[PDB]
Amino acid sequence: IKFTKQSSVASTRNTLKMAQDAERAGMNTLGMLGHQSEQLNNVEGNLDLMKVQNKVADEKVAELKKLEMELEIDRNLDQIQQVSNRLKKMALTTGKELDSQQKRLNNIEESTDDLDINLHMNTNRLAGI
Amino acid sequence: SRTAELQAEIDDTVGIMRDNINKVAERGERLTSIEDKADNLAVSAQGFKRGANRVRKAMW
Amino acid sequence: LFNDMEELVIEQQENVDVIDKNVEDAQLDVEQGVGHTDKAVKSAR
Amino acid sequence: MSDPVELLKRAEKKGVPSSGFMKLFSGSDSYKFEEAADLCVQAATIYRLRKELNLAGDSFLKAADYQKKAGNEDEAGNTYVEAYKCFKSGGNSVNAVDSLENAIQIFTRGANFKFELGEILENDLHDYAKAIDCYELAGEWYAQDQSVALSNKCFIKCADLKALDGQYIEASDIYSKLIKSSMGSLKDYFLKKGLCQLAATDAVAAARTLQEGQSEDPNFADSRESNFLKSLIDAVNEGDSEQLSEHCKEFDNFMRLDKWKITILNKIKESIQQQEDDLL
Amino acid sequence: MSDPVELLKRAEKKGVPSSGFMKLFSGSDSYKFEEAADLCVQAATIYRLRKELNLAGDSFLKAADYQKKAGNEDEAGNTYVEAYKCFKSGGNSVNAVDSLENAIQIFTHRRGANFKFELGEILENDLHDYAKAIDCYELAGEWYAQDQSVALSNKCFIKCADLKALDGQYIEASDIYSKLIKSSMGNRLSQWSLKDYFLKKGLCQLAATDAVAAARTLQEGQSEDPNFADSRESNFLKSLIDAVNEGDSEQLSEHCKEFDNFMRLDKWKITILNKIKESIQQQEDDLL
Amino acid sequence: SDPVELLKRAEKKGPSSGFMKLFSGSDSYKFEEAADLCVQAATIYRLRKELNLAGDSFLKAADYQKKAGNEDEAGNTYVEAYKCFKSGGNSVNAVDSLENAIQIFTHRGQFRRGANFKFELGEILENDLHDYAKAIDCYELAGEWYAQDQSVALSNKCFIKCADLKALDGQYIEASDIYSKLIKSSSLKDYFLKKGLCQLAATDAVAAARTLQEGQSESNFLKSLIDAVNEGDSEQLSEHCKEFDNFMRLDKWKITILNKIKESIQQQEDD
């Protein structure tokens, strides 16, 4: 009887351990995802400012060209349950944030290509003046 | 019944995390593409700056 | 799975860094260029 | 490949401003400084190829200086960031700090680099005061950019370093700001706040922090962190350092105390033992 | 659409340098090379539209050569990268290698590292030139360490160390794993790779019959990283060291099976473990 | 403010000769003016919700910008004309709009954006016009461009839309090969199952068993089908399909292919 109960004491301590490892990993994932979200914020912002500046450059260039054991199992399960519920929250959380950032990256990237093209256009026009 | 519920929760969270692995892989793809295009944008910006300055010196 | 949620986001941190630097650099040279064309236009007239 | 030393010598020769009668016939010296900067950049690239990173950083610093003289401050900031890359790659943290300071001054992206400067000051040079300053100012710039997350990482670092440096009240205030910015890490912020308030022998403020966290955040109410902070407050009020140590071991057994918490808890225990001794 | 063959013929005709008496009356040949490169690029684009990828790559190589002759090295590197894209996508790995080598030589003269890593990938997977792939990964990771992309340096060095260990250079792979450990210490973000790095360092050392160094590596890992101390990897490495010291290959096989059941042994580990087993069995045969 | 009048003037203005060429500035400027006039009329139409007229105005615009020598802007205006024509249910001219936009995007080296719209084009060929033989071509060329861009996900999506549709057109083995390439360069269950079903629809059961076995490195229903087919029994299959319909409702594709397999059994019973 006793050997098995020791075996499950081992199983549940190790379970609580690696669950905590999942927990800490998931939070620091979310931390850097916020960090990188805000980084993509400024990427968008400079793209916006450059869009305005390329409008100005377009017009200027155009004008230029013109010009005991049971209890411990129970407690370990308690705490594993707590962590597991909370980790579920963390998984749903990461999925949502990745989704939002994915649309943001797509828009950022299209804007970058457009700005790049406009800059080659203006540079080529300026070369002929 | 508690252990089974905990298991169901863990399996669901595994599913969500596998989805996340797929999403972060797509994100890493996208970020590599964006870094390439941002390098392109930077180079084009230096080029446009220099061309405009040369147009000034040609005119003046 | 979480461990891959940690390592891959690290691999992507770098991409974010280089992107931000290159993009704002491009913005400053676009500003310099727009000013260059503004002074181009003033004396072209 | 060109010899980078010769390139630097030509950059030096071109970088001399036009003096005297010559100034009346030479055009703007800006072009000369641009060309000297380009030569220095070529020398820096060649040094980077040879893995002579400190020399490459020095060449980038010279190029950035010439760019500043040319009126191309933005090129100078970019080149200072490149000199920084060369120096912090070469293990010359001091010149890396200098390069970030010049780049940040030009940029004021500043925040990003001000945070990296704080990191160097903390880990490589152990100038914790300036690292605290760097994190605080970076976090403020982020808060101005409505960047809650980047502001938060800066204020976490600032509060941690302040608390380790004995500035418990200021660290508790920064934890209060983190709490206010995160409402709606939060459990951890409540714990740390109380801990600083216990290191300042301000037990009642810790009790208020506990009550606040219990009332405002249900997740903290039922958390191990809240129970642990309560138990610590009870021990501090009772003047029993051994009970505090027992609570620390229990919390360690279930949730590993990192180095920071250990250090704060040791100081709190030390305070308790001091009033015990002072009463004998 | 213009005939790309005719465009290449015109590019060839224009790309002739001015020789003799004509050189006194002709301006810089740079402009002729630029125009020839433009014609080559147009031919390459037309080939790419036709899915004749290898011909597009060849046209881009010609364009990059003319760009080099024109003094526009940066454009030449870009065009070598395009030639590369055409070659990799056409299944012509050799010309892709050549294109990356020219492009890297130009860029080096952060991005060079990127293309050097890609070159290492081609050498490993398509051409199976493991030695030059090792060289590419080493140099790329070195450049990334000189650029403080710690993670790219780590990815290049894990590739380099894995290839070195598979190639019998166990000591050098162990040294690279020491560097990886030293670069991964104290980061909450590399702790899992840290357990793997300790395990692979120990396995490489055991493949070198230096059980002493394996025991020291395990002790270091147990002392420096609590997560490794209690990990399955640390216990497994203990067990392998113990089997090696006992000269009991069957015990090592049992340990490998036990570790496999809980944590799948990837191919690299299987190879190195089999090498360790063979070293044990050889010592048994020699003792008898 | 009358869009009719805007288009009248856009016709009158959009190549000068004689004294007019001499006195007045460059021709491309006039073509740009006519382009802008048609854009203004098109926006008035879009606001007033005459989408077909808005898209025709954008077509006139697009032709005018490319007559000015603005290929990119022309492509953009063609996409805009497509937005109008698509939102207005006029599929034919919407397909035309994309073919011009793509034509530009392609000749202009913008393959990634080409692909994005190549796929959208294929979607309207498949869903609305039902010209599958050309939707397969679009789904194929778009995925090949995505392959060049190293954006595996989108390339895969394209080749799945290709393979599914080729399995419907009856190119069963080609579909199974596309599916194999979709397994190597990678949901992985469905690729195996679809491959086996297509291969069984070609009356090639040996390969079908092989390809499940390869899938040990859904799959059980495929055995149950390989057995129902290997013993000329279109009641075992018809029952296994009925049973699998409970824990995973069959989509249209599977129903079609499975009916083809059932028929390939019955024809073999009466031979």
Secondary structure class of chain A reads mainly alpha
Query: SSE order of chain C, as H and E?
Result: H
Strand content of chain A: under 5%
Largest sheet of chain C: none
Q: Which oligomeric form is depicted? A: part of a larger assembly
Name the structural class of chain C.
Answer: mainly alpha
End-to-end Cα distance of chain A, whole Å, is 93 Å
Inertia-based shape of chain A: rod-shaped
Rg measurement of chain C, Å: 20 Å
Helical percentage of chain A: over 70%
Helix content of chain C: over 70%
Radius of gyration of chain A: 28 Å
Q: What can be said about the biggest beta sheet of chain A?
A: none
| Record field, number of beta strands of chain C | 0
Instruction: Count all strands of chain A and give the number.
Output: 0
Provide a count of the helices of chain A: 2
Keywords:
part of a larger assembly, 6 chains, B: 60 residues, mainly alpha, 1 helix, rod-shaped, D: 280 residues, 15 helices, translocase, snare, NSF, Sec18, AAA+
Please tell me about this protein's structure.
Chain B: Keywords: Coiled coil, Isopeptide bond, Lipoprotein, Membrane, Palmitate, Transmembrane, Transmembrane helix, Ubl conjugation. Chain B: Its main location: membrane. Chain B: Belongs to the synaptobrevin family. This is part of a larger assembly, with 1 copy of chain A (129 residues), 1 copy of chain B (60 residues), 1 copy of chain C (45 residues) and 3 copies of chain D. With 129 residues, chain A is mainly alpha-helical. Chain A is built from 2 helices and no strands. Chain B is rod-shaped and about 85 Å long. Chain C is mostly helical and 45 residues long. Helices cover 81% and strands 0% of the residues of chain D. Classes of the chains: A mainly alpha (129), B mainly alpha (60), C mainly alpha (45), D mainly alpha (280). Chains in contact: A-B, A-C, A-D, A-E, A-F, B-C, B-F, C-D, C-E, D-E, E-F. Chains A and B meet through α1 and α2 of A and α1 of B.
